[PDB]
Short mmCIF file of all heavy atoms in Angstrom, two decimals:
data_model
loop_
_atom_site.label_atom_id
_atom_site.label_comp_id
_atom_site.label_asym_id
_atom_site.label_seq_id
_atom_site.Cartn_x
_atom_site.Cartn_y
_atom_site.Cartn_z
N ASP A 23 63.94 -28.76 127.52
CA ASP A 23 64.56 -28.69 128.87
C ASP A 23 66.06 -29.05 128.77
O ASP A 23 66.37 -30.10 128.18
CB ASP A 23 63.80 -29.59 129.86
CG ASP A 23 62.37 -29.15 130.10
OD1 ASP A 23 61.98 -28.10 129.53
OD2 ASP A 23 61.67 -29.88 130.83
N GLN A 24 66.91 -28.20 129.34
CA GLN A 24 68.38 -28.49 129.36
C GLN A 24 68.61 -29.69 130.30
O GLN A 24 67.91 -29.79 131.32
CB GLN A 24 69.16 -27.26 129.79
CG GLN A 24 68.99 -26.06 128.87
CD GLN A 24 69.86 -24.90 129.26
OE1 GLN A 24 70.64 -24.97 130.21
NE2 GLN A 24 69.72 -23.79 128.55
N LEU A 25 69.58 -30.54 129.95
CA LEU A 25 69.86 -31.75 130.77
C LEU A 25 71.11 -31.52 131.59
O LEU A 25 72.10 -31.03 131.02
CB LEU A 25 70.02 -32.96 129.85
CG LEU A 25 68.82 -33.33 128.98
CD1 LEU A 25 69.12 -34.59 128.18
CD2 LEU A 25 67.59 -33.53 129.85
N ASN A 26 71.08 -31.85 132.89
CA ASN A 26 72.32 -31.74 133.71
C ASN A 26 73.14 -33.00 133.48
O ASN A 26 73.30 -33.79 134.44
CB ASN A 26 71.98 -31.52 135.20
CG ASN A 26 73.13 -30.95 136.01
OD1 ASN A 26 74.14 -30.54 135.43
ND2 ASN A 26 72.99 -30.95 137.31
N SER A 27 73.64 -33.17 132.27
CA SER A 27 74.42 -34.39 131.90
C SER A 27 75.27 -34.06 130.67
O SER A 27 75.03 -33.00 130.07
CB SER A 27 73.52 -35.56 131.64
OG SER A 27 72.69 -35.34 130.51
N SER A 28 76.19 -34.95 130.30
CA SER A 28 76.98 -34.74 129.06
C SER A 28 76.03 -34.72 127.85
O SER A 28 76.24 -33.89 126.94
CB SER A 28 78.04 -35.81 128.90
OG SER A 28 77.43 -37.11 128.97
N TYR A 29 75.01 -35.57 127.87
CA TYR A 29 73.99 -35.59 126.77
C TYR A 29 73.14 -34.32 126.84
O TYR A 29 72.87 -33.85 127.95
CB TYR A 29 73.09 -36.83 126.92
CG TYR A 29 73.82 -38.14 126.96
CD1 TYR A 29 74.13 -38.74 128.15
CD2 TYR A 29 74.17 -38.79 125.79
CE1 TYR A 29 74.80 -39.96 128.20
CE2 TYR A 29 74.84 -40.00 125.81
CZ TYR A 29 75.16 -40.59 127.01
OH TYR A 29 75.80 -41.78 127.05
N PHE A 30 72.74 -33.80 125.68
CA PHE A 30 71.87 -32.60 125.63
C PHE A 30 70.60 -32.90 124.80
O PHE A 30 70.72 -33.59 123.78
CB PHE A 30 72.64 -31.37 125.11
CG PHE A 30 73.03 -31.44 123.64
CD1 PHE A 30 72.22 -30.88 122.67
CD2 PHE A 30 74.23 -32.01 123.26
CE1 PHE A 30 72.60 -30.92 121.35
CE2 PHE A 30 74.61 -32.04 121.93
CZ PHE A 30 73.79 -31.50 120.97
N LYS A 31 69.44 -32.42 125.26
CA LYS A 31 68.17 -32.60 124.50
C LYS A 31 68.22 -31.76 123.23
O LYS A 31 68.68 -30.60 123.32
CB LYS A 31 66.97 -32.26 125.38
CG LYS A 31 66.21 -33.45 125.94
CD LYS A 31 65.87 -34.50 124.90
CE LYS A 31 65.19 -35.72 125.50
NZ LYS A 31 64.90 -36.73 124.45
N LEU A 32 67.72 -32.29 122.11
CA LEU A 32 67.67 -31.52 120.84
C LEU A 32 66.23 -31.57 120.29
O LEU A 32 65.71 -32.69 120.17
CB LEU A 32 68.65 -32.12 119.85
CG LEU A 32 68.34 -31.86 118.38
CD1 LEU A 32 68.67 -30.43 117.98
CD2 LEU A 32 69.07 -32.86 117.49
N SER A 33 65.66 -30.43 119.93
CA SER A 33 64.33 -30.44 119.29
C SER A 33 64.55 -30.29 117.77
O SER A 33 65.00 -29.21 117.36
CB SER A 33 63.44 -29.35 119.83
OG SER A 33 62.16 -29.39 119.24
N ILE A 34 64.20 -31.31 116.98
CA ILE A 34 64.47 -31.27 115.51
C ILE A 34 63.22 -31.66 114.74
O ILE A 34 62.55 -32.65 115.12
CB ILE A 34 65.70 -32.13 115.19
CG1 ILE A 34 66.02 -32.17 113.69
CG2 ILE A 34 65.57 -33.53 115.78
CD1 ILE A 34 67.42 -32.61 113.39
N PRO A 35 62.83 -30.93 113.66
CA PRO A 35 61.59 -31.23 112.91
C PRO A 35 61.64 -32.55 112.13
O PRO A 35 62.63 -32.82 111.47
CB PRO A 35 61.49 -30.06 111.93
CG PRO A 35 62.92 -29.59 111.77
CD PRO A 35 63.54 -29.77 113.12
N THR A 36 60.56 -33.35 112.19
CA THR A 36 60.48 -34.59 111.38
C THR A 36 59.71 -34.32 110.10
O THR A 36 59.59 -35.26 109.29
CB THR A 36 59.82 -35.73 112.18
OG1 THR A 36 58.53 -35.29 112.59
CG2 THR A 36 60.62 -36.16 113.38
N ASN A 37 59.19 -33.11 109.95
CA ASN A 37 58.37 -32.76 108.74
C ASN A 37 58.85 -31.41 108.18
O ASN A 37 59.39 -30.60 108.97
CB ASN A 37 56.89 -32.74 109.07
CG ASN A 37 55.99 -32.72 107.84
OD1 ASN A 37 56.43 -33.10 106.76
ND2 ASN A 37 54.75 -32.29 108.01
N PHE A 38 58.69 -31.21 106.87
CA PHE A 38 59.15 -29.94 106.24
C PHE A 38 58.02 -29.36 105.39
O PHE A 38 57.18 -30.12 104.90
CB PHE A 38 60.43 -30.18 105.43
CG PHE A 38 60.28 -30.94 104.15
CD1 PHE A 38 60.24 -30.28 102.93
CD2 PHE A 38 60.22 -32.32 104.13
CE1 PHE A 38 60.11 -30.98 101.74
CE2 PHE A 38 60.09 -33.02 102.94
CZ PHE A 38 60.03 -32.36 101.75
N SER A 39 57.99 -28.02 105.25
CA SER A 39 56.97 -27.36 104.39
C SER A 39 57.62 -26.21 103.63
O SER A 39 58.65 -25.70 104.10
CB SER A 39 55.80 -26.90 105.21
OG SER A 39 56.22 -26.05 106.27
N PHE A 40 57.04 -25.84 102.48
CA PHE A 40 57.57 -24.69 101.70
C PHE A 40 56.54 -23.55 101.73
O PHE A 40 55.36 -23.83 101.45
CB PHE A 40 57.91 -25.08 100.27
CG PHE A 40 59.23 -25.84 100.14
CD1 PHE A 40 59.24 -27.20 99.85
CD2 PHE A 40 60.44 -25.20 100.31
CE1 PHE A 40 60.43 -27.87 99.70
CE2 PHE A 40 61.63 -25.87 100.19
CZ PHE A 40 61.62 -27.21 99.88
N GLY A 41 56.97 -22.35 102.07
CA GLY A 41 56.05 -21.19 102.10
C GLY A 41 56.67 -19.98 101.39
O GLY A 41 57.91 -19.85 101.45
N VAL A 42 55.84 -19.16 100.77
CA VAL A 42 56.36 -17.98 100.01
C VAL A 42 56.11 -16.71 100.83
O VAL A 42 54.94 -16.47 101.20
CB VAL A 42 55.73 -17.88 98.59
CG1 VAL A 42 56.20 -16.64 97.87
CG2 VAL A 42 56.03 -19.11 97.76
N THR A 43 57.16 -15.94 101.09
CA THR A 43 56.99 -14.65 101.82
C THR A 43 57.01 -13.53 100.78
O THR A 43 57.98 -13.45 100.01
CB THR A 43 58.10 -14.48 102.88
OG1 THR A 43 58.10 -15.63 103.73
CG2 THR A 43 57.92 -13.23 103.71
N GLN A 44 55.97 -12.70 100.77
CA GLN A 44 55.87 -11.64 99.72
C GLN A 44 56.30 -10.30 100.33
O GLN A 44 55.79 -9.95 101.40
CB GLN A 44 54.45 -11.60 99.15
CG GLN A 44 54.01 -12.92 98.52
CD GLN A 44 52.61 -12.86 97.97
OE1 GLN A 44 52.03 -11.79 97.81
NE2 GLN A 44 52.06 -14.02 97.66
N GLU A 45 57.23 -9.61 99.68
CA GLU A 45 57.74 -8.31 100.18
C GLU A 45 57.66 -7.28 99.06
O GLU A 45 57.91 -7.65 97.89
CB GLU A 45 59.19 -8.45 100.66
CG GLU A 45 59.72 -7.20 101.32
CD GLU A 45 61.23 -7.08 101.31
OE1 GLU A 45 61.90 -7.87 100.64
OE2 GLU A 45 61.75 -6.17 102.00
N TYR A 46 57.29 -6.02 99.38
CA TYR A 46 57.29 -4.97 98.34
C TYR A 46 58.27 -3.87 98.73
O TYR A 46 58.18 -3.37 99.86
CB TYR A 46 55.88 -4.40 98.16
CG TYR A 46 55.84 -3.09 97.39
CD1 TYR A 46 56.16 -3.06 96.03
CD2 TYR A 46 55.49 -1.91 98.01
CE1 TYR A 46 56.13 -1.87 95.33
CE2 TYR A 46 55.45 -0.72 97.30
CZ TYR A 46 55.78 -0.69 95.96
OH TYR A 46 55.74 0.46 95.25
N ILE A 47 59.16 -3.50 97.82
CA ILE A 47 60.09 -2.35 98.08
C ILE A 47 59.85 -1.29 96.99
O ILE A 47 59.86 -1.67 95.81
CB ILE A 47 61.56 -2.83 98.11
CG1 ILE A 47 61.79 -3.93 99.14
CG2 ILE A 47 62.50 -1.66 98.30
CD1 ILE A 47 63.25 -4.27 99.36
#
């Protein structure tokens, strides 16, 4: 939700994961 103030809300991840995307050309 945007804040009607100088401060702004930020959504930031506290966890990280590694994933492999497979592509064929």
